[PDB]
Amino acid sequence: NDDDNTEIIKSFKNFILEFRLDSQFIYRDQLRNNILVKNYSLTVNMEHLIGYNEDIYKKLSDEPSDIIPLFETAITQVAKRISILSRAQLLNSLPTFQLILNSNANQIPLRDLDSEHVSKIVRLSGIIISTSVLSSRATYLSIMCRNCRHTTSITINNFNSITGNTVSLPRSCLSKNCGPDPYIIIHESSKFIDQQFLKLQ
Amino acid sequence: MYYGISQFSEAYNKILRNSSSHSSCQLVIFVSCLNIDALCATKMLSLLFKKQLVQSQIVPIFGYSELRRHYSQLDDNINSLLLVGFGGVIDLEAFLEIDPQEYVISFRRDIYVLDAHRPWNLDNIFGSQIIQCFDDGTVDDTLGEQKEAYYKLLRKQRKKQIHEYEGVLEEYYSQGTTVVNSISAQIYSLLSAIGETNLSNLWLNILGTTSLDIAYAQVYNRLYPLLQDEVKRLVKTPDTLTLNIQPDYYLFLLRHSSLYDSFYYSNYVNAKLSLWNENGKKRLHKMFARMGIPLSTAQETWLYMDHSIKRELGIIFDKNLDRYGLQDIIRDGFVRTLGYRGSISASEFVEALTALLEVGNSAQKLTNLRKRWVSNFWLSWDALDDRKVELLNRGIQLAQDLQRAIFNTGVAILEKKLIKHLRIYRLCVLQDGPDLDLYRNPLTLLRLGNWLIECCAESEDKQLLPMVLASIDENTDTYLVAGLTPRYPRGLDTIHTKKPILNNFSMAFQQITAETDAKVRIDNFESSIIEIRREDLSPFLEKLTLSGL
Amino acid sequence: SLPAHLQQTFSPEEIQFIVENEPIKIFPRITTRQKIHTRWQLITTDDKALNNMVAMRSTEVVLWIALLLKQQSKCSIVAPQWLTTKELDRKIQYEKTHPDRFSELPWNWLVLARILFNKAKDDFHDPIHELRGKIQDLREIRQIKVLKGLKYLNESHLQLDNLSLLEINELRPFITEIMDKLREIHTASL
Amino acid sequence: NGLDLMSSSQQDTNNLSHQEQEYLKEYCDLITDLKSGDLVDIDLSGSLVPPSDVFIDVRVLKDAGEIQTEYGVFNLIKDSQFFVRQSDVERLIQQGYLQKI
Amino acid sequence: TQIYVSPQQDFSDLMKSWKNERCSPELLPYPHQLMKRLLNRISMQSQLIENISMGFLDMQNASNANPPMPNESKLPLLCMETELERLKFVIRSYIRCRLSKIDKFSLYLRQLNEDENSLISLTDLLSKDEIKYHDTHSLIWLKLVNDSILKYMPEELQAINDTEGSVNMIDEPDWNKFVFIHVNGPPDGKWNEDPLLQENEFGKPCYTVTIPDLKEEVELTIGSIYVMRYEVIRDLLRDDKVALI
Numbered sequence A: 001n002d003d004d005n006t007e008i009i010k011s012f013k014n015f016i017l018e019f020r021l022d023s024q025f026i027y028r029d030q031l032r033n034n035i036l037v038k039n040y041s042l043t044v045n046m047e048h049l050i051g052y053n054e055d056i057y058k059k060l061s062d063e064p065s066d067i068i069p070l071f072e073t074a075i076t077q078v079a080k081r082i083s084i085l086s087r088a089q090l091l092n093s094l095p096t097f098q099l100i101l102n103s104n105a106n107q108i109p110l111r112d113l114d115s116e117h118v119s120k121i122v123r124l125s126g127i128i129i130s131t132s133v134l135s136s137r138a139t140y141l142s143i144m145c146r147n148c149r150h151t152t153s154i155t156i157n158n159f160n161s162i163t164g165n166t167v168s169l170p171r172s173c174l175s176k177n178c179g180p181d182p183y184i185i186i187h188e189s190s191k192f193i194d195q196q197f198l199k200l201q
Numbered sequence B: 001m002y003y004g005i006s007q008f009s010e011a012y013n014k015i016l017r018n019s020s021s022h023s024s025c026q027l028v029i030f031v032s033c034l035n036i037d038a039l040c041a042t043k044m045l046s047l048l049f050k051k052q053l054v055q056s057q058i059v060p061i062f063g064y065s066e067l068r069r070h071y072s073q074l075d076d077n078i079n080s081l082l083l084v085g086f087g088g089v090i091d092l093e094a095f096l097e098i099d100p101q102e103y104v105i106s107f108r109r110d111i112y113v114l115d116a117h118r119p120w121n122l123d124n125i126f127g128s129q130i131i132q133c134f135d136d137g138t139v140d141d142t143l144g145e146q147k148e149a150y151y152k153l154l155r156k157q158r159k160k161q162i163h164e165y166e167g168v169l170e171e172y173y174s175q176g177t178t179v180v181n182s183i184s185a186q187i188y189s190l191l192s193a194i195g196e197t198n199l200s201n202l203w204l205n206i207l208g209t210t211s212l213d214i215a216y217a218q219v220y221n222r223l224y225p226l227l228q229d230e231v232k233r234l235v236k237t238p239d240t241l242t243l244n245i246q247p248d249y250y251l252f253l254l255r256h257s258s259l260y261d262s263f264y265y266s267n268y269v270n271a272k273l274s275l276w277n278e279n280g281k282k283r284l285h286k287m288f289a290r291m292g293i294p295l296s297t298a299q300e301t302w303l304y305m306d307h308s309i310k311r312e313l314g315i316i317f318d319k320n321l322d323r324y325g326l327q328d329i330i331r332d333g334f335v336r337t338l339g340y341r342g343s344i345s346a347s348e349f350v351e352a353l354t355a356l357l358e359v360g361n362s363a364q365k366l367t368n369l370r371k372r373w374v375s376n377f378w379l380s381w382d383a384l385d386d387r388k389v390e391l392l393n394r395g396i397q398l399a400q401d402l403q404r405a406i407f408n409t410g411v412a413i414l415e416k417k418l419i420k421h422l423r424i425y426r427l428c429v430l431q432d433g434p435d436l437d438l439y440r441n442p443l444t445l446l447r448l449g450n451w452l453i454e455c456c457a458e459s460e461d462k463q464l465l466p467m468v469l470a471s472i473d474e475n476t477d478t479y480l481v482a483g484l485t486p487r488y489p490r491g492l493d494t495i496h497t498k499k500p501i502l503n504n505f506s507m508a509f510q511q512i513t514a515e516t517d518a519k520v521r522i523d524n525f526e527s528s529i530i531e532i533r534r535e536d537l538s539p540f541l542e543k544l545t546l547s548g549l
Numbered sequence C: 001s002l003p004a005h006l007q008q009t010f011s012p013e014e015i016q017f018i019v020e021n022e023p024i025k026i027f028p029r030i031t032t033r034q035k036i037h038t039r040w041q042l043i044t045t046d047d048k049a050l051n052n053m054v055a056m057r058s059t060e061v062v063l064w065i066a067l068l069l070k071q072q073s074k075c076s077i078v079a080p081q082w083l084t085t086k087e088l089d090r091k092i093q094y095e096k097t098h099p100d101r102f103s104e105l106p107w108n109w110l111v112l113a114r115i116l117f118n119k120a121k122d123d124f125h126d127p128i129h130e131l132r133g134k135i136q137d138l139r140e141i142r143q144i145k146v147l148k149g150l151k152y153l154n155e156s157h158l159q160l161d162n163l164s165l166l167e168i169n170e171l172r173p174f175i176t177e178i179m180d181k182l183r184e185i186h187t188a189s190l
Numbered sequence D: 001n002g003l004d005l006m007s008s009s010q011q012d013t014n015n016l017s018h019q020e021q022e023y024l025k026e027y028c029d030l031i032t033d034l035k036s037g038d039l040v041d042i043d044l045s046g047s048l049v050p051p052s053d054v055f056i057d058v059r060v061l062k063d064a065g066e067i068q069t070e071y072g073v074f075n076l077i078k079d080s081q082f083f084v085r086q087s088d089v090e091r092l093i094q095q096g097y098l099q100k101i
Numbered sequence E: 001t002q003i004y005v006s007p008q009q010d011f012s013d014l015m016k017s018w019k020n021e022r023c024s025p026e027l028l029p030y031p032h033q034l035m036k037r038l039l040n041r042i043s044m045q046s047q048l049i050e051n052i053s054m055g056f057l058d059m060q061n062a063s064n065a066n067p068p069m070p071n072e073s074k075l076p077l078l079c080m081e082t083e084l085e086r087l088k089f090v091i092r093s094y095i096r097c098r099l100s101k102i103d104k105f106s107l108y109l110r111q112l113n114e115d116e117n118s119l120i121s122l123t124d125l126l127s128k129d130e131i132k133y134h135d136t137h138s139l140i141w142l143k144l145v146n147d148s149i150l151k152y153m154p155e156e157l158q159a160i161n162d163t164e165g166s167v168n169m170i171d172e173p174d175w176n177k178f179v180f181i182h183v184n185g186p187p188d189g190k191w192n193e194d195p196l197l198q199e200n201e202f203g204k205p206c207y208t209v210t211i212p213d214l215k216e217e218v219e220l221t222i223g224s225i226y227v228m229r230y231e232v233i234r235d236l237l238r239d240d241k242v243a244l245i
């Protein structure tokens, strides 16, 4: 189970560290310039990914929502590798890097979307009619108990691939005779990101 | 023959002995513009002479007037001249008023002419020492009889010998113009004999040999096995170079456009299925439905098209294409891969090169057009190197646009039935229409004519007649007329291929011009393309009808 | 020369020239040992090596002469010792294990590398891409160390023991101007 | 080269004051005199980019006739490519007659 | 210099002087003898190459004869001519840099030259052609400024060499500019006979300099690159103890 995830992360790390045309490793310099300006994000062109290897593109096209977090954590692993000195052993305030994709595939009209486009990567065009106000989303939650009263941390990603995707509270305590879910949320010492809604016509 | 294939190296050595200098340019090359084979040969020679640090200059020319003017411009310091892609069919000494005694000292200069056209000037062979050429293996065997007559022609009953010599000379002449070998092939044979072959040379030779697939398929089939054997003789790290023999098809930019557009714009499938009317489109949709590829899937780019059907395309074609007579589309081609940039094929490369030649960037505007053509040739030459790909993507998109325009004009011609069928030859004139300004290019006109010839040949008619095509340019008020030979269907056996169809249009044009005072201008290197006046076309045509072809 | 502000610092072309004005080893393909022929008789290089030469032997010539002979088939440039994987491994281990010292490395660093990878491509025993990647990793490590060390800029002096030519050149104007500003601020304050 | 390049930069140079124009002429005189001393064998107003290669490809930019060089002659046909020595065409390149160094 | 070990030594001295002058904020003296040798060397080398080229040309053009062998013939003359071009480029850059520097500091050097108490003379710093350049350029610029602007101001401030009032007009060089140095040590192979160098822990011979403004002492060891101001480093640079990068 975990071995396949490590293999995929290693494959993406090899791709990002190895991709060079002529005499430049473009993605590594892109990471350097992004980190220097406090823009923890990376842009992947799909044609380069296809040309490097086809199996990774096939896997990304098959199950995008599962695969993407592995890539977006390989990116932050490589960034911490090529930006921070170990010094024979801190701040480490580097969140998970955002992945941005570009492609040149055929466009699909809005009315042509049907049941066969579920959980697939699509490209389309439209007009923006309204923008919602921004809201907060938790990423690293500090969870505290009441009876046994210990500390725990929950790491949650933004991709779901399903309706639920949510581990609300673990059943039973971590090992006396506590309740089913005797936990609360410590709002301080927590990390939050921003989300927005849009309407397309 | 003057220079046999085995003697090439010797001549090459002479060039060094006459051109290797420290601070003097002693070699000048004239190339046949608007020709892919000439460009390939020029690139190979340029690399060769850059290897040994021999200083040189490259000068493209368009017409015989430019050739004569530039030859007049030259100085006596230039010991060696190269004339690649033309000059075989005429006697240069008469054209260039070359005095052998002015250039005797012997070998004051050297002029190496290297051309492919099989019929040429026999006096240029057997008369003059100063002019010298590289034979492809034709004089040694075919010309065994004509040389005796020429040597003998160089007591009252001796007139029989003179009559026989004149008859032999006439029989040797009155032959249509043809091409039987490749300049790039000859240069690569020389390189193989010398010992400087490599992958760049092989790629250029492949381009030069595959540029003839459209018109000289017999020559292409004769030359293919040598290329196959030579490429046999010679982890995806970012610096691998792969040259492989992968199956390919007679399709228009298959790996850069959608499969649907490829099947739609492929000339052979167009001819075989009559795509200009609605029944062709119905049969194409039948093809797709029976193969099983979804239409919306087949209308996607080749990069993003489904991997499973990409893998199974060969089997799908092999199982589906037999019913409808398209099984001749499958062939074997060369694929070049370098790094992570992708894969390309020789056919796509030559299509991109031709399109970039076509589109890029009275007497005064004619000169401006010829200068723009020279600049386009230079741009196409610069696009050859692997360090530039924005000069090849543009060529590919221009090829797509030009093929679209050609298809749009051809369907209109076919539906309006402007093809007039005479007793001897078919005639078609483009009096009016859209985008007529594009057809001022001879290669664009030849592409249009090739498509029309394919469409006419893929019919039930049992008459092989030459086709005459004309255009208009309103600024000049002249007709650009090109003569075209008939072609056999590509799916035919070699038994009925004793000799390629000859072209008598140049002979007919020159005879009519020599007997009437028409205001024409025959200066193109291709002798079957002339410029005629709008007012003078019709009587001229009548003469062509009433003259012996 | 003036050309705007190009009188204060060296251009990269001048750096390449001054680096390529250095000796190097060569394995010749031909021989021109004197018949016991035209004398080389240069004015800024020992002609004894060029004149007294014989094929398949080691000798030292200036870099540009080696490049000129490499343009022809008369040369085979011998790679230096520090252009190999087994030395670069211990080098990168040295920088990683020492988070304060710049590693010992010739001041022609990155420049001989660029030139050799540009011209002498086929004479390397190790694959080119791996060496280029290792060099890139060293460049990244030294860049990180330089950024870490620049955080303090005293007004009196500063020390940089093992910086190459290009690293010094690309940093000279900023450091020079900042230090000059600080110095003049202190001088005006007293 | 101290010639002010009136054949090619502003054309009339009339935006300069007359005093500035005579100052320019005096400075051109000084430039001409400077290389007339003990440095006569060095082109001081030549290129300042260090020489890096001996042979380069050169593409013609403007049409002319034929120009003599040492031991040879170059005919400047419009849109032609030369494979010549670098240090023989620097004067032409500075004047703008050649392109694609 | 008094004698040559080898022409390569002259080449090295020329390059070192060029590098020193390029980054120096002050106009340094003039090495007459080095260029005196170099110009004669260039002249004789050019004469030799032209002579051999003309001889081969006459041999090749008197009759057909035998063309010269490409081996050991083209490559040598190619090497001589490219080396001569490189040397000419270096000398040209050096001379043009000196011209720019004397352009900037014309008034200051003219002011110091007329001072009798100053031990430095303009003759040592400037070549004769540079003297002519300085004087003629100064006269022409003075004529221009007098005709254009100075004709209209009153007598109180017509002089452009005024050093009174609010702001002075003479530009002294910035002796406190920060420069990059490499401690070359003693030019001798013994590198241990100088009366200035001392030692620290683990040996490490070094020179001790002081900054009067900061009342500090700085240790400068052999083989370490330093970024240090210029005012106190003039002596070490002059004695070829350190080399500017």
Ligand SMILES: [Zn+2]
Residues within 6 Å of the ligand: A147, A148, A149, A150, A173, A174, A175, A176, A178
């Ligand atoms: Zn508990």
